[PDB]
Point group: none
């Protein structure tokens, strides 16, 4: 417990009280913490940019965090600060007052009821506005999945990358370019976005291996072989947007402005 | 000059100035394009070594460093600040799409009032913005219709083109020469809520001079809003913010809570 420095605001560790570890990754630990200047709860991610990364990875991580902290959008989880202290990159992130789309899905399932189409567009047209904004700054999301999508008591969607909310907390959708080449680009995000549009409508991912077999899973991605959504519940517009996003060739996928445009016209159509 | 993509938003080499869009006491403001991503930006150039004493320079650098940490959808984002060419360079979120000043003039010329529902829609966003700024202990210092931007999608952005921080709505604590504090933002906020409903400032007059203005402010003398068009909730919020005594004005948390409840029921 070092002394407060109000003049530093969110840019020093002395102005936070760590509560407990809530996550650990390849290069990082994540903590629940409280800001001591205003009592706001945050996520404090500590990245070992000197000890666990080569020189290129460190310079790329610092550039990427600097961009993420410039995003100002209602549907993106805030990056409030990034600063070097104690030989680590310290990142201060928002924890939203919202549950994951994963929980919303698991709940609608254990109560056997489909998420209605006019709702699916509700959320999806917020997830799209989020991903438009990130792609406009040349920021790739890299892991779009239900657990990273948060949803406010009020129906406000926050896209994040920690899978952490304030009170409630092989990548989830494997693209062809991941499977075949370990490739990830802007169009990889669009594949995942399509898979998530599907999972909201189906209540499960498009792709499962037979008896959970990982080879069977790769064969089903290569054929884009997923059970069709029931058409009496979902328009051609929707099932067609899925089909456009879940295309093995990333060049042939639509860019996030097209998908966001479709998700705006459908959100006003109802 | 030579592009420097390793530097990001932190050198003048990664921007092309397009045109000048503002002039303040200590600063010039440019529309610019980031050459790394084509994102349009505002570029403010602050004369911290020409026009200021050492005290004002150090206050300006401290304040810009705290403004740089604000992050809220209804606040203009400060992307970067750095010293180059012997000036303090600030790269900021560009709105330039529309502002409450233009929206008020449009309704005026069309001889129509802003529905109360529309007032709360824009006002709750401005209250969210200021509640963020106040929670971080940052005062705005120049709240007026021209600093309230509106994006093409109807999103409010509270900015400060000219850096009028560091007036449109005369406050009692400029008449008394007392000092600008967080309650001085609340007076402006109430004057701005009035102006949205009336399409003119509470103390505006056709033939307006310093004497009459002072008298009016001393008496908090402004024309009542039409109760036929604006609710008791709207007219009483304006009345408690437009209070000579800063210590009796509500804090921004109160004003935001009222705006959040008035928006939810009128929509």
């Amino acid at each position: 417990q070092k002394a407060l420095r109000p003049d530093m605001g969110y840019n020093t560790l002395a102005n936070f009280r760590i509560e407990k570890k809530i996550g650990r990754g390849q290069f990082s630990e994540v903590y629940r913490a409280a800001c001591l200047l205003d009592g706001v709860p945050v996520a404090l991610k500590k990245v070992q940019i000197f000890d666990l990364m080569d020189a290129k990875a460190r310079a790329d991580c610092i550039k990427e965090i600097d961009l993420l902290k410039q995003l100002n959008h209602p549907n993106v989880i805030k990056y409030y600060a990034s600063f070097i202290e104690d030989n680590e990159l310290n990142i201060v992130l928002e924890l939203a007052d919202a549950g994951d789309l994963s929980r919303m899905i698991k709940h609608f399932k254990k109560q056997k009821r489909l998420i209605p189409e006019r709702t699916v567009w509700k959320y999806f047209v917020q997830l799209c506005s989020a991903l438009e904004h990130m792609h406009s700054r040349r920021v790739m999301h890299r892991d779009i999945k239900p657990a990273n999508v948060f949803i406010t008591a009020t129906g406000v969607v926050k896209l994040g990358d920690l899978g952490l909310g304030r009170f409630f907390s092989t990548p989830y959708y494997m693209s062809p370019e991941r499977i075949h080449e370990n490739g990830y680009n802007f169009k990889s995000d669009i594949w995942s976005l399509g898979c998530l549009l599907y999972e909201m409508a189906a209540l499960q991912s498009p792709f499962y291996g037979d008896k959970m077999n990982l080879y069977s899973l790769c064969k089903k991605i290569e054929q884009c072989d997923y059970p069709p959504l029931p058409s009496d519940h979902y328009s051609e517009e929707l099932r067609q947007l899925v089909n456009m996003c879940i295309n093995p060739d990333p060049e042939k996928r639509p860019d996030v402005t097209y998908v966001y445009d479709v998700a705006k016209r459908m959100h006003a159509c109802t």
